[model samples]
Target: APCECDVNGETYTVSSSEECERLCRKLGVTNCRVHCG
Candidate 1:
């Protein structure tokens, strides 16, 4: 299963937590919901 991070209605599948953090940081997002499937 892949982990997904929903940021601003855009769903991003991320393998690494560090990378996910990078995207969140880039988007300046403080809140995000997680989805794994």
Candidate 2:
């Protein structure tokens, strides 16, 4: 499954919600919302 993360107004494609948040934080993004499929 893939997750589309809206991180500070930008979109990122990741493996899961967890990865989305993790990647966002790793890139120094404080807010990340995810839609997983």
Candidate 3:
């Protein structure tokens, strides 16, 4: 999973799907849905 960090009271964002797909192309994860609910 992508790591999360904070910067100047704002959260830093990283795409797990993107990272995963980049690291493992066989997974075939093209879409990313990041939400807080």
Candidate 4:
């Protein structure tokens, strides 16, 4: 399944939510979450 990451109001596509959160942290995105729903 695909995951959609919400990074500081921006949306990004990723393979997994885990990776999305990892990238969000690395990219300094404090307000981040993955919408795998």
User: Judged by TM-score, which candidate is best?
Assistant: 4
Residues 1-37, candidate 1: write the lDDT tens digits.
8778887778899886666777888899977656666
Candidate with more favorable, higher TM-score: 1 or 3: 1
- Per-residue lDDT over 1-37 for candidate 4, one digit per residue giving the tens place of the 0 to 100 score: 5889999888999888898989898998799988775
* Candidate number that wins on TM-score, 2 or 3: 2
- Give the range of the ten consecutive residues with the poorest summed lDDT in model 3: 28-37
Q: Which candidate's lDDT is highest?
A: 4
The 10-residue segment with the lowest total lDDT in model 1? 15-24
Give one digit per residue, the lDDT tens place, for model 2 in 1-37: 6779998898989987888889998989788789987
Q: Under the 3 Å rule for N, CA and C atoms, how many clashes does model 3 have? A: 0
Full candidate order by lDDT, most accurate first = 4, 2, 1, 3
> What's the true lDDT of residue 23 in model 2?
91
Per-prediction TM-score to the true structure, in the order listed:
0.56, 0.76, 0.29, 0.79
Backbone clash total for model 1 is: 0
Candidate 3 Cα RMSD (Å): 10.9
Clashes of each: 0, 0, 0, 0
Model 2: number of clashes? 0
Q: Write the per-residue lDDT of candidate 3 for residues 1-37, one digit (tens) a residue.
A: 4554333334445565344334333434434334221
